[PDB]
Design a protein around this ligand. Structure first.
Ligand SMILES: CCC(=O)SCCNC(=O)CCNC(=O)[C@H](O)C(C)(C)COP(=O)(O)OP(=O)(O)OC[C@H]1O[C@@H](n2cnc3c(N)ncnc32)[C@H](O)[C@@H]1OP(=O)(O)O
Ligand SMILES: [Cl-]
Ligand SMILES: [Zn+2]
Length: 284
């Protein structure tokens, strides 16, 4: 894709820059390869339930009155109060997942090809009211990850950002890893916002464990949390809670120092994953 001013005499081919979804309008952050004909109109209109993308307010309004979807496809594997997660296999809901990937790419620097959804499972987060289940965000996961990634992409839609939904999704990804009896880590590279979110999540989990146990190796923490030993080490380093002794990382902290960290404004997830509300078994 091109940016900047086009040369003298040329026509700028417009990309999608604004979407209307439910009762939100959202500006694009990046180019997404919707077909060129969809980019030329002032807005792209998305059905908030089936994610079909449309070119006109009038086709949108017709769709709104006809489409019977009021939630994501697939299985509702998590429900606590009005928060739900649906598991959507890319092989079985190809069109929905393609629509989701084109949406997501508007807010991601890079992504795998939007049509290549079969290798992935998608976990869709919704807030539920009387009208339906309204998409907040999602993460995707490779069914088989050569690199041991437990998340491929993660997104909270911009109007829902900074409310804890991203850390909910991160927590959720590690609950899956724990049930699979494996460690995992997000696919690299992480965006700057990605880095802040993961570091916040990892810090909170590790601090919480170091005070609930009170004191427990890095291996122990990894097995308990499914966080990789490398991500534990980088997080403990940022907490000033690790020493290096003859080439080996050694946790070094007291209960008092853990509490100082937990009592500070820098480290309290507004919504957490309740295992009792999760219904999921590993495939595998
Ligand atoms: C796995 C590979 C990838 O997917 S890399 C790409 C990751 N995704 C993206 O960059 C897409 C666009 N961004 C997003 O969707 C969101 O920013 C993500 C990364 C999902 C975070 O979601 P969100 O629901 O806002 O997270 P959260 O409320 O749970 O807060 C997480 C911590 O991050 C911080 N944070 C967040 N946004 C900002 C910001 N604008 N400026 C400064 N800090 C920010 C929050 O304060 C929070 O940290 P803390 O717990 O308050 O210390
Ligand atoms: Cl916006
Ligand atoms: Zn629809």
């Amino acid at each position: 894709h091109s940016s900047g001013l086009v040369p003298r005499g040329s026509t700028k081919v417009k990309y999608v820059d604004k979407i209307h979804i439910g009762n939100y309008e959202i500006d694009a952050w990046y180019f997404s390869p919707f077909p060129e004909d969809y980019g030329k109109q002032p807005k792209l209109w998305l059905c908030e339930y089936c994610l079909k993308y449309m070119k006109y307010e009038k086709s949108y309004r017709f769709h709104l009155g006809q489409c019977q979807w009021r939630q994501p496809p697939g299985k509702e594997i998590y429900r606590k109060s009005n928060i739900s997660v649906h598991e959507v296999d890319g092989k079985d809901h190809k069109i929905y997942c393609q629509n989701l990937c084109l949406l997501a790419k508007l807010f991601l620097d890079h992504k795998t090809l939007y049509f290549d959804v079969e290798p992935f499972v998608f976990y869709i987060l919704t807030e539920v009211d009387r009208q339906g289940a309204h998409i907040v965000g999602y993460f995707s996961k490779e069914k088989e990850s050569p690199d041991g990634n437990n998340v491929a992409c993660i997104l909270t839609l911009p109007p829902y950002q900074r409310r804890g939904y991203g850390k909910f999704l991160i927590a959720f990804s590690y609950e899956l890893s724990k049930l699979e009896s494996t460690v995992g880590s997000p696919e690299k590279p992480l965006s700057d916002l990605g880095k802040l979110s993961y570091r916040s999540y990892w810090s909170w989990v590790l601090l919480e464990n170091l005070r609930d146990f009170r004191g427990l190796s890095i291996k122990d923490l990894s097995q308990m949390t499914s966080i990789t030993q490398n991500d534990i080490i980088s997080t403990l380093q940022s907490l000033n809670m690790v020493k290096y002794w003859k080439g080996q990382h050694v946790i070094c902290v007291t209960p008092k120092l853990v509490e100082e960290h937990l009592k500070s404004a820098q480290y309290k997830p507004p919504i957490t994953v309740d295992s009792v509300c999760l219904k999921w078994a590993p495939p595998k």
